[PDB]
Structures are given as C-alpha cells and as structure tokens.
Design a binder for this molecule. Structure first.
Ligand SMILES: [Zn+2]
Ligand SMILES: [Zn+2]
Ligand SMILES: [Zn+2]
Lengths: 1187, 246
DNA sequence: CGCCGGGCCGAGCCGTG
DNA sequence: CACGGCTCGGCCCGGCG
C-alpha cells in the first residue's frame, strides 16, 4: 500500500544523494569520464535500454509488455526495430544486430550478459555449397554457458525470427557441416567440459537439419577437427559456443523452448515438439514402505564423487540420515535447508552456517542455515547411555563423549523446493505441525469449537476447550500459538489421544519402524519377565514412570533400545529408563497387557495400531541424504596477484609489480599507456589534469607506423586513421615511465607518504589502456583495501535468504529500526520490543561482520578520497561498523552485469550475507551455494569506469554496467515463484503426501509467489512455518579449513563416518574416496613419462630435455613440470585406507601394485640406498604378497 | 605427581633440540632411577636413545614411574626460551599438564598438555661392532660439513690404528684421514677392516650441537649401522643408531 | 656488542588433479 | 573447477667474531 511505496521513495532519495556526490566529484575532470558511469534503471525496460539500446526503446517495451506480456512484446519490439521506428541503423546486418540484441535482452529480462558477453556477432551468409541463398549466422562465445541453456535456447528463436523478418532464407548445411558439428559434440563433451545433457549424434544431426539459422562463432579451444575447412567455417577447432548453444540449449530445454514458440506462435518448430514428446492381507505401513520404495528411487548422484576432506553424512535414503520435515523457516526456503545446530556440532563442526551440502532428494545444492526448533541428533554416549541432544549448548557439553550418532535428526526442506525440482512428495514424517492440526480438527468435529494454530484465538473458544479437556487456558494458548516450542507432558499427550482420539504426540513417538517385529517382540518378553516398573496414574490413565532392567537379562535388546531413539542411562550394570520416555516405551506397548507377536507383512506400527487404544503414526519414514561441499566464504576479492591500483608497471616492480620499489629503485619503465597533453602549457604525462595550470588534458593518439601523435579533436577529424598512414590511430603506446617523479607527484597531491608498498598492474588489459590516477592507489594502500578490474572494491559472500528477523539477532536498536521505517512486526502489532519478528523489507540486507569489518575500511577510503583527492566533505564518517547502517550497497552477481541497490540494516556473526529472496533472485542467484559480490554504492560511483574494463575476456565476473533500484518480483527470476509462503501447511497436504502425489497435483492448496504477482501484496506479507532462535547461532567456520594435511584430512573426513549409523564407511567411504585416490596417482604416473619441461626465466618449455640442460636467453637450468614429489603425494593415505578398512580386493591389489610401479619406475635414478633397521611394520603390500 | 630441578637449562634445551631434529613426538619414561627416552625416526633409519640418571639433577623428585607424552616441537620452542644459567623445573600433579618453571632473574611458568604416544618399543642391545673409535666433536662436525659439499652419503673406513672418512660425488673428492698420532683422534679400537656408508643428512642432524670439548664414541662394522654416543654432564649420555646404505 | 650463513616462513607460481 | 608440491624473497636468527 503506502508503507512500501514510502520505502522505495526513500531509497530513491538516498540514491539520488549518492549521485549528487558522484556528479560533483566526477565533474572535476579528474577521472576518465565527466559523468558517472553506472546508470540506474527501474525495470527490465530500463535495463535493456541502457544495456543494449536502442535509444527510447524502454518506453515502448513497457507498453507492449503492458498489453501482451514479456514474450509477445519482445517480437513486437523486433518489428518496430526492423521497421525503423527508432531511426536508421544502416546495413541489413546492423538491423539484425540491434533487433537480435534487444530481443534476447528483453527475453532474459536483461539480468544476464548473454546479449552482450555471449553473442559474439551476427552475419548474413549464403548457401554457397547448396544454392547460394542467404541465411543468418550467429557467433556465440564461451561465456554464454554462464547464462544457462534457456537464454541460450531463446537466442535460437530470435535468430530464426529476425532472418524471417529480414526476408532471409533458411539454412541448409551440407553433410560436412553436420558431421563436423557432431564431431564437435563428441570431442567437446569428451575432453573440454561435460555438457549438462549429452545428446546422441542422431539428435545432433536432427537439430543440424532442423535449425534454419547457423549456430557458430569463433573457436573456443585448441582442438583440431576432422571435417576441416568446411565452406564458411573459418576455423578447424572446437566451437564451444556453437556446441553449448546446440546441446545444452534447444536440446536440453526444448520443452520450455516450444513453450515460447506456443506463446509466440512461431511456425517451423514442429520437429522440436516431436523431439519433446519423443523424449517423454498386508499391513498399512508395510504397504506404504513398499510403494515408497518403488515409486521413489533412491538417487545416488551426490555420492558419485567424494573429494578428500568432504564428509559423507548419510547414504542415499538410509534411515538415520537427515530425517525430513516439510516446512520453511525464516532463513531457509528459497533453496537452502534448515538444520538443528546440534547436528552441526556433533559432526565435529564440519557443517557451518552456509556450507553447501549436496543433497539428493529435493535437488542438488542445499545451503545450510540454523533452525533451532526442529529436532537435532540422537547420540550414544561412550558409557552406553543414549541421549537426545536437541539444543546447541548441550551439544557443546557432550560433543566429547559421542560414541555413536544414531540419528542426524531433522532437515527442514521447503515445499516449493519440491515444486520447482518437480520431486514426488515423500511421505511426511509425523511432525507437530501435523499433530496440532489433527488436534484442532478433533476439537471441532467433536466439540464444535473453532481454534487455529500459529495465531491467537478468541478467548471464549480457548476457555471452553480448556473445560472439555480440563487444562490450563494459558497453557492451551501457548500450545496453540507455538506448538513447536511447547510440548505437553507425556500424560497430557496420552490424555489428549485418549479423549480426542488423535494419535500420540510426535515428540513422544519412538522410531518404532526402525525395528523389525521380531526384535520388539523379544524386547516385549524381556520387559514382561524381568523389568522393574514403577507405575503412575494421571486422570485414570495408567502409565509407567521408570524402568530398570539389568543388562544381563536385556543383552542384545540394548541395541533395540538404541535404534528406537530411547533415551536411557546405564548405572551399576542396569539399564535405566527415566520418566519422560518410560511412558513412551510402554504406552504404545499397552502397558504390557496385550501380547506383541511379530506377524508377517506387518510393520511394527501396524501391529501397535492394530492392538492399542492409543494409535501412533510413524515418525521416521523419509530420510534424505547429503555430502558436504564448497564451504562458506566471506573473503575479500583480491585479484590473483593482489592489486591496489590500476597503473601498468611492466617488470619494473619485480615479481609482485610493487610500484614503490620501482620508484625508490628509480628504474624506468616501458609500458603501453596513454598520455594527455596540457593545451595551455604543453605538458605531457599519463595524468588527467595539468601540473602547470590544472586544466583537463586532451588524449593523445598514436599511429603504430609513423608514430604520429595527435590531440583528440584532430584524430577525431582524421577518424583516428593516419593522414600519411592508412592505419587506425591507437590511443596508447609502449612508453617510458618514470615511476619516481610520478609517485612523487602523487604523494605531493594527496599528502600521504607512509605506504608500505603499492602493488600495481603488470599491464593494462583494457582497450584504451588508460591508467588509474596514482592518488587513488595511495589511498587504497593507506587503508589496505584491494581493487578489482573495473576499479570497484568487491566482497564475495555466500548468500542465504531470510524474510523475517528478530532485532535481537542482528544487533539493532528498536528505535533505529523505527528510523529505517519498520513500524510493525509481522502480525501487524506495533513494534515495541527487541524480540518481535519483523518482516524484512525487500531490499534490505543483513551483512556478515566480516563485511562490516571490510566495508568499514572501504568507508574510510571513500572519505579520504572525497576529501584528500576530490576536495569534498566526508560522507560516511564511519568509525564502528554500526555506522554503516542505512548506507546502500550494490549487490552484484558474477556472470551478470546489472547490480541491485540494497540497504544495510544490521549485522550477524556468521559468514553469510542475508537478504530477502527477491534480492537474491533478481541478482540471478540460484541460492544453491552461489557466491556474490557486495560493493558500497558511493565507491562504485566514484571509482568505476568502463575504460578499465578488460577488452576481450568477459569472464565469470563482470561489472555493474547498470543498477536496478526497485525490485519487481515479476521480472526477477523463476525460482522465487515457487516459495511456500503459508503460515502452516494445511492438513489436506500432509494427508496428501502419503499417496505420493506429485507436487503439482496440489499446487492450488498451498500459497506461493506466482499466486501473488501483479497484486500490490507481493511485498506486503509473507510468512514462514518454523521459528529459529538465532539466524547466526551455530559453529561459524567450517572445520574443513582448519585441517592442513591430506594424511589426516582423510582421517577426519572418515573419522566421522565411524560415528554415524548412516554412512557405513567401512567399505564405501573409503572405496568411493579410495577410488578417487587411485585415479589421481595413476593419472600422474601415466603422465609423468609424458611431460614437458620449463625454466623459471625462459618460460619456453621444451617438450624434451636439452642434453646440455641450459636454456634460451637464460644460461640456466630447466625445471621438471610434474615433479616426483607429486606422484608420491597420496601413497601414505591410500595405503592407510587399505590397511584399515575392508575394501574390495580389486582396489587393494591395484594400490599395492601401484606402489610397486612407483618403485620400479625409478629403480635406475633413485636407487635403493638407505637400508632400514626395523623392517616390515606390517605393510599391506608385502604381507599381502606373502599370501 | 613429580617435581624435578635441573640447572643450566640452556644445555638441556640443546640436547632436547638434538633429539628434536629427528623425531616430532616422543614419550619420556620417567622412573625413580631417572628420566629415559627412546624412539626412532619416521624413516626407521635412526634410533635415538636418551638416558638420564637422576644424579645429574640438582633435585630429583619422582613418586612412582610414569610416561610423559609431549610434542617435541612445542617443548623445543619452550625450552629454547630458557637461557644460559636460568634454572629449569618440571612439575606434574593430578591434571594432564606439564608445568615448566624457568626461574633465573624471575620465575616463568609454562604448561604443556601431555599427548598420548603410541609406543613402539624396539630395544637393540650390543651388536657385532668391528671397530670402535673415540674422537673430538668438532672433528666429526667439520668432517660431515665437508662431505656435505660433494655428496649425500658419507663413507667411513676404519683400518688398523687409522680412521679415515671420505665421500665422492660426480667430480669432486673429499677425504679426511687421522690416526692416534693425530690430536683429534683420542682412541681407536681396531678389530679389523671396517667400512660403511651413511646418510649425510642424518649425520648432519646428529652432530649439530657439538663443541670442540665434546668426545664421541662410534661403534660399527662392515655394512651395518653405526652407534654413536656421547655423555652429558658425564653421567647421562645419548646414543644414536644409524642404519647404513646400499 | 656486529655480520653472515643458515633457517623459517610467507609468496608466487607453477603445475597438474 | 581446486589441491599439493616447488621454488623465491624477506625476516630471524646462532655462531663466528
Ligand atoms: Zn598547463
Ligand atoms: Zn602514420
Ligand atoms: Zn631459461
């Protein structure tokens, strides 16, 4: 309504403030431009007009999308392009270029760089082999892979449409075209990079015959081909651009593609539709597990690869792994999980707040984020006691005695995380969110009182039901409000199930199905014949209160109790079952009054439900798996050689190109640079303003032939081509730089002298090769902040979602939050206390205190740059990190070129920068562990300029070519549109899982984001099922990084797997991981005998040793590329694993055999010399051979 | 629960360094007789045998007998922080810590968490040692440093009343002869011709930490391990056992 | 106490996996 | 896409002096 619009008006004001500063500062002519070089937009229309034009196109695109939508308005704009409504482009290929770029831009919503980084060129060719007719040829580039198949595939569609609009002909390849292309398929898939979908060759020729436009471009790898020199293909190497666009594009996403054909009604694609369709008695729970095992196949992708150090947490679909609970906590939900921090500690602190554990069921790539309300592990202490460990602090207390982790406990999967990946719903574990629903439903069908969980009911109903139940009205209030965090004691649970008839409470439900009926039978007899059972009675209900039985009688059943998750202790050779669970171990067993006979075809719960007045539902039925991966980050962004100023220095600084060494050493440089000339005075130098008089200096142009120098206006006349040379005028030239006098002028200008070093750039890679002013380098160094290729300072951080936050968590005063606009918490109540859950507005972000501790330095930088160098008032005045609150930061992805303005509203302690998922989506993230950049606003304004952008390799990172200032979740992304924003999953769902309905069979029930688009109440109110206590509580740095040696890396990685039930190392954590060890050593050994050589100084490595051992230019020696220390690097571990763990003999004999090969490969260079005095400490190799 | 008082902490730190340069962890068999050490390199090429009779200590208080398990690296940095004459004290009570007290001009207290050491005991008594020679420290130290120039394997040759060392590489040649007549050769006990070769690296780890006023014993036979020995305050001496090559 | 030859570490810098 | 080994300067010495 109005609050939200006040919000966006607010951000628009402060952004306008920042632009005021940057326009004044840039106005001084000191920088490469006289204007700010990051335009702001508001929609995808603005993003397309400013990314790829043409001028004015946004105004039209907004209307046409207003009438027809996204897809249709794309093609309409294409028409007005070719119809010249925006002016004359000139040649036909320029109209092709413009319409194709604007088209694909509007189609991907301008958030990626395919329209820029990917599509290399567009050309009009002739079927000179077939009939010489015209067609359209698209030149991609490797970075198109970044923008994924879909945007790639749409590039085809536009390529087909444009040529039709341009009256061009279809393409008609010859069989050499086709077979060379398929060859590119097999080779590129085989050696370069594994395609996501590897199509068959027949499919490849299918597309080759059926795509009227040419999928081509410049070759991407040095891989020669067999169908060389085909007519028109000007290269005989693999074209990864054409290849990827071919395979992972129209092929990998042909379904969605013909969806766009249908939405656009573009003829000539029926073959793709055909390709699409061408590609397309007995107890209750016993039956349920049966159908469950058949319809839902236990995937095994995540366990395919096991890098060393990456733990495996549970075998696929194995009971004992992450018990599953549908839901969506405050943090999780976009693509992450939640998890009880207890299970993050008892796994020896591998997992952190953000370590991307690779999942198997809902989709590969779940981030982890704490959720304290779900139930953490069940462990077995060393002294035999079994302990349920739900909370963090108890986990710290007992981490040392953990003898076995029976149950990893919960993992809160979102629902929409099923909808998108299109997983079949797994049967829901019996969780209180479903219990309480059966509660209120029973009270309605019985006593006609209407309650509702997770809210606040009317007092009358509360008291009435209090009466029919005989329970505290206060207590019933609390249980109805937060059922997760408030559990009625066991006797109330028995009583509720008794009166109301609903099943037993989940929290007191054992894991009865992890035990076959025989075992529980045996336990029944033991209990009946030997236990000592003190009884009790609550409201006429008879329930046990303590059990004790000597371990001699019990014996093997002790394992049974262990599998039932039954918390019990051992004292004096006696098993002790204390109060809150001794009732749970016997109430389902009917207090030992009705005999338990293992009946075939029944699961244990089926029997118990068959003979008990108290009915259960299974608590453990769905079991996800996972394997750790790609742990958290919040580092800085340092270039590979750390940089602190963009000023080419060549070799003159040494290895690290430290400019200050070249200064004090007084050397002189020869580096390509640009010089400007003071028109007033006639001074010349690589700076922008004059030393003599202080006016702006005109660029100097150079002929590479005649070495002619021309001021800018002159070379403007000459069109930047020589008068007496027919060559283009370069802007730069390999020149002579005096680092001394320059750096002296810098220190003179900004008044800073105490720089330890000033690391420069070995060579300008930008097109202009215009160098940054040195003053900025001095200020960076003085504060110790690093730079990135555009001139902006970035800060990678693993991003995770949130949507509601308790101001306790983030360290913010409630008055401050009242100053940012946050009036009322999520239930509408007035914000008064630091423990009410507020709703994060869309573009706010909670930075990690890393980001505070670094962006603080960026603040001191930007101040000292405003004052000392531009001569302006300070702007941040940051002294602690909590001064930044309210100042905008541009969140930017890799692979894209449109950043999103955000506002900071606090800090947490973990290493993960939170944000509203609309933010993380509009930044194009997957939030399956992706990492993002976060620069400060006024920095990126003051220090960015396209002139610094490298000219050729648009890589995985790119720069904020334009910044959005207003989320619209329409043109954000797709993957947001599936979030579950319901306060509690409805009863109909939980019952709807059991028959394994696919998710779309019930999308209409559960609210989502697609079910609020267009309306204003996209931003207004979302919700979440599960509370956390802290967003940051839990081990804040993965144990992976404090592990140095592979030798004991594997000893931790596989130290764990003895602990858990689920993993079963003793045979497969090794052998998977052991298989990895075998491959590296063998590969190195095979390669070693075929290697190359190389000197430190004459990089030139002769594919053979020169007999002398000397080198060119050098009079030196040649080093060995792949050194013998490398071949032997994993024998210690891999031999260890084989001597310890039952591994299949094939891999054992392979390893001992590879030992013998390492020795006999060197029995003539490193002879056997040093005898040893203690021989054969039982090595598996020799002791194996003695067999 | 013991306490121990040793003077000249810098010396003791030196010898503990000596043991340190070959192994990384080790256990100290403290008995009421004295402190004992015995361990072997990772390579199973050298055996360090430390023997410390209680007599050497200015005070020696052991109640029973126990094995200490310590990080030789951490202890090496610690003891290395002592100086020429400051007094060393080693205390241990109930808890699983070792308390090192360096008291010279002042008292300084350190605590070291003891570490479990999987003990692999290999006791190797007297063996057939053809020749046996005593020699000043700096003689052998100089010699090893010389063989470091030309090769990595130093060859020893013991003949009647004459001890000669040698080593040869690609081109260069290194020879060091000396007999009883010579000053540095205190004693020779020639049973017959002996010859061996040893890793110059290991020897360098051995003889570092030897002044001119250091007497060294060397027993060995034809193609078999050397046993080196030298005394420490004339009571507790250290003995290395180096396997030959080839 | 100084120097200087060795030692230990932080830095590229590579490679390959 | 990510690890270890290998070699390189920069401090940090212990011994000669
Ligand atoms: Zn001038
Ligand atoms: Zn010219
Ligand atoms: Zn060379």
């Amino acid at each position: 309504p109005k609050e939200m619009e006040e919000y966006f008006e607010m951000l628009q004001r402060e952004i306008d403030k920042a632009y005021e500063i940057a326009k004044k500062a840039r106005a001084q002519g000191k920088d490469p431009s006289l204007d700010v070089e990051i335009p702001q937009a508001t929609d995808m229309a603005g993003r397309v007009e400013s990314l790829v034009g043409p001028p004015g196109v946004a105004k039209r695109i907004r209307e046409l999308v207003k009438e027809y939508g996204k897809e249709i308005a794309a093609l309409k704009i294409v028409d007005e392009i070719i119809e010249g409504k925006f002016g004359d482009l000139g040649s036909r290929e320029k109209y092709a270029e413009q319409a194709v770029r604007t088209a694909l831009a509007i189609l991907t919503e301008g958030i990626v760089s395919a329209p820029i980084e990917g599509i290399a060129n567009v050309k009009i060719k002739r079927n000179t082999w077939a009939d010489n007719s015209e067609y359209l040829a698209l030149y991609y580039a490797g970075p198109i892979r970044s923008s994924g198949g879909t945007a790639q595939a749409l590039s085809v569609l536009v390529g087909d449409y444009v040529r039709r609009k341009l009256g061009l002909d279809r393409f008609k390849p010859s069989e050499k075209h086709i077979e060379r292309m398929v060859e590119e398929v097999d080779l590129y898939h085989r050696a370069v990079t594994r395609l996501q979908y590897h199509p068959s060759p027949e499919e490849v020729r299918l597309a080759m015959r059926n795509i009227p436009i040419e999928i081509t471009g410049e070759a991407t790898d040095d891989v020669e081909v067999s169908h060389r020199d085909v007519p028109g293909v000007e290269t005989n190497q693999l074209r990864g651009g054409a290849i990827l666009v071919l395979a992972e594009g129209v092929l990998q996403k042909a379904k969605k593609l013909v969806k766009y054909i249908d939405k656009m009604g573009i003829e000539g694609w029926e073959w793709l539709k055909e390709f699409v369709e061408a590609k397309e008695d007995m107890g209750f729970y016993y039956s349920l597990y049966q159908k469950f095992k058949e319809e839902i196949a236990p995937s095994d992708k995540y366990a395919k690869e096991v890098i060393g150090g990456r733990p495996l947490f549970s075998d696929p679909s194995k009971p004992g792994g992450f018990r599953l609970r549908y839901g969506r906590s405050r943090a999780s939900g976009f693509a992450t999980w939640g998890i009880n921090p207890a299970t993050m500690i008892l796994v020896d602190e591998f997992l952190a707040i953000g370590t991307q554990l690779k999942t198997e069921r809902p989709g590969k790539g779940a981030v982890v984020t704490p959720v304290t309300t779900i139930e953490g592990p069940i462990v077995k202490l060393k002294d035999g006691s079994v302990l349920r460990v739900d909370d963090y602090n108890l986990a710290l207390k007992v981490r040392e005695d953990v003898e076995e982790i029976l149950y990893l406990g919960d993992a809160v999967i979102a629902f929409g995380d099923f909808v998108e990946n299109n997983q079949t719903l797994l049967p829901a574990n019996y969780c209180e969110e479903w219990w309480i629903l059966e509660f209120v439903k029973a009270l309605k069908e019985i006593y006609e009182v209407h309650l509702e969980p997770f809210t606040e009911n009317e007092e009358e109903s509360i008291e009435e039901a209090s009466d029919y139940l005989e329970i505290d009205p206060e207590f019933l209030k609390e249980m109805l409000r937060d059922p997760l965090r408030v559990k009625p004691p066991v006797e109330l649970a028995i009583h509720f199930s008794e009166v109301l008839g609903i099943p037993l409470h989940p929290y007191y439900t054992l894991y009865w199905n992890s035990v076959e009926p025989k075992d529980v039978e045996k336990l029944w007899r033991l209990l009946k014949n030997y236990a000592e059972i003190e009884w009790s009675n609550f409201r006429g209900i008879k329930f046990a209160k303590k059990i004790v039985i000597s371990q001699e009688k019990l014996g093997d059943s002790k394992r049974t109790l262990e599998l039932l998750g039954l918390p019990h202790t051992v004292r004096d050779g006696n098993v002790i079952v204390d109060y809150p669970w001794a009732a749970a171990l016997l109430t389902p067993l009917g207090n030992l009054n009705w005999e338990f006979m293992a009946k075939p075809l029944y699961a244990t719960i089926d029997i118990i439900n068959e003979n008990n007045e108290i009915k259960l539902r299974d608590r453990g039925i769905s079991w996800i798996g996972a394997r750790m991966g790609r742990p958290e980050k919040a580092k800085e962004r340092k270039m590979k050689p750390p940089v602190q100023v963009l000023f080419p220095i060549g070799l003159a600084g040494g290895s690290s190109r430290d400019i200050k060494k070249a200064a004090e050493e007084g050397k002189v440089a020869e580096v390509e640079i640009a010089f400007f000339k003071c028109p007033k005075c006639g001074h010349v130098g690589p700076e922008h303003l004059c030393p003599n008089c202080g006016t702006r200096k005109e660029l100097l142009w150079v002929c590479p032939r005649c070495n002619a120098e021309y001021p800018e206006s002159q070379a403007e006349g000459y069109n930047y081509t020589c008068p007496k040379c027919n060559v283009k005028l370069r802007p730069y030239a390999k020149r002579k730089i005096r680092p001394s006098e320059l750096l002296n002028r810098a220190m003179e200008n900004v008044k800073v002298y105490g720089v330890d070093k000033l690391k420069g750039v070995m060579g300008m890679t930008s097109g202009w090769k215009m160098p940054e002013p040195l003053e900025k380098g001095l200020l960076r160094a003085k504060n110790d902040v690093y730079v990135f290729k555009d001139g902006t300072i970035r800060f990678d951080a693993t991003d995770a979602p949130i949507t509601h936050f308790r101001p306790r968590e983030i360290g913010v005063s409630v008055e401050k939050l009242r100053e940012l606009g946050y009036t009322h918490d999520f239930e509408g109540k007035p914000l008064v206390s630091e423990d009410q859950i507020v709703e994060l507005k869309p573009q706010d972000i909670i930075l990690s205190k890393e980001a505070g501790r670094y962006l603080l330095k960026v603040a001191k930088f930007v101040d000292d740059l405003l004052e000392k160098f531009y001569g302006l008032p300070r702007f941040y005045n940051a002294e602690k990190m909590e001064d930044l609150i309210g100042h905008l930061v541009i969140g930017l992805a890799p692979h894209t070129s449109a950043g999103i303005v955000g506002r900071i509203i606090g800090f947490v302690d973990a290493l993960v920068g939170y944000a509203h998922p609309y933010f993380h989506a509009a930044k194009r993230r997957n939030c399956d562990g992706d990492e993002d950049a976060v620069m400060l606003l006024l920095d990126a304004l003051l220090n960015f300029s396209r002139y610094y952008l490298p000219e050729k390799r648009g890589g995985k990172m790119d720069a904020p070519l334009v910044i959005t200032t207003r989320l619209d979740p329409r043109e954000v992304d797709s993957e947001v549109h599936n979030m579950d924003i319901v306060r509690y999953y409805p009863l109909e769902f939980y019952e709807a899982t059991y028959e394994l309905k696919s998710p779309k069979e019930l999308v209409g029930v559960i609210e989502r984001v697609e079910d609020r688009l267009g309306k204003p109440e996209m931003y207004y109110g979302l919700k979440f099922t599960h509370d956390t206590d802290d967003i940051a509580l839990g081990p804040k740095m993965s144990l992976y990084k404090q592990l140095g040696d592979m030798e004991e890396k594997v000893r931790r990685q596989l130290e764990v797997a003895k602990r858990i039930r689920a993993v079963d190392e003793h045979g497969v954590a090794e052998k998977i991981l052991n298989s990895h060890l075998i491959p590296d050593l063998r590969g190195n050994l095979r390669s070693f005998t075929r290697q190359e050589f190389r000197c430190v100084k004459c990089n030139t490595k002769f594919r053979r040793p020169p007999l002398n051992g000397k080198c060119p230019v050098c009079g030196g020696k040649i080093v060995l590329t792949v050194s013998k220390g490398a071949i032997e690097k994993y024998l210690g571990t891999a031999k260890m694993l084989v001597t310890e763990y039952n591994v299949k003999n094939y891999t054992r004999q392979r390893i001992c055999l590879t030992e013998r090969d390492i020795d006999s490969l060197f029995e003539n260079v490193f002879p056997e010399t040093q005898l040893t005095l203690i021989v054969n400490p039982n090595d598996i190799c020799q002791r194996l051979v003695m067999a | 629960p013991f306490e121990i008082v040793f003077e000249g902490a810098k010396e003791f730190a030196q010898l503990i360094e000596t043991a340190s340069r070959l192994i990384d962890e080790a256990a100290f068999k403290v008995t009421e007789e004295g402190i004992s050490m015995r361990a072997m390199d990772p390579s199973r090429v050298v055996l360090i045998d430390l023997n410390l009779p209680a007599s050497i200590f200015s005070k020696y208080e052991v109640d029973g007998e126990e094995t200490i398990g310590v990080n030789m690296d951490h202890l090496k940095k610690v003891l290395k922080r002592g100086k020429a004459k400051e007094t060393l004290i080693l205390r241990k009570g109930e808890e699983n810590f070792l308390e090192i007290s360096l008291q010279g001009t002042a008292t300084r207290t350190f605590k070291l968490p003891l570490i479990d050491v999987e003990e692999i005991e290999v006791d190797l008594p007297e063996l057939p040692f053809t020749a046996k020679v005593v020699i000043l420290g700096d003689v052998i130290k100089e010699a090893v440093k010389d063989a470091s120039l030309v090769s990595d394997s130093m060859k020893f040759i013991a003949k009647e009343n004459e001890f000669t060392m040698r080593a040869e590489g690609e081109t260069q040649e290194v020879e060091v002869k000396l007999t009883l007549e010579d000053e540095g050769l205190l004693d020779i006990e020639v049973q017959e011709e002996t010859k061996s070769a040893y890793g110059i690296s290991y020897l360098s780890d051995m003889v570092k930490g030897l002044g001119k006023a250091d007497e060294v014993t060397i027993k060995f036979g034809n193609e078999m391990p050397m046993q080196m020995e030298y005394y420490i305050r004339d009571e507790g001496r250290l003995i290395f056992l180096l396997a030959p090559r080839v």
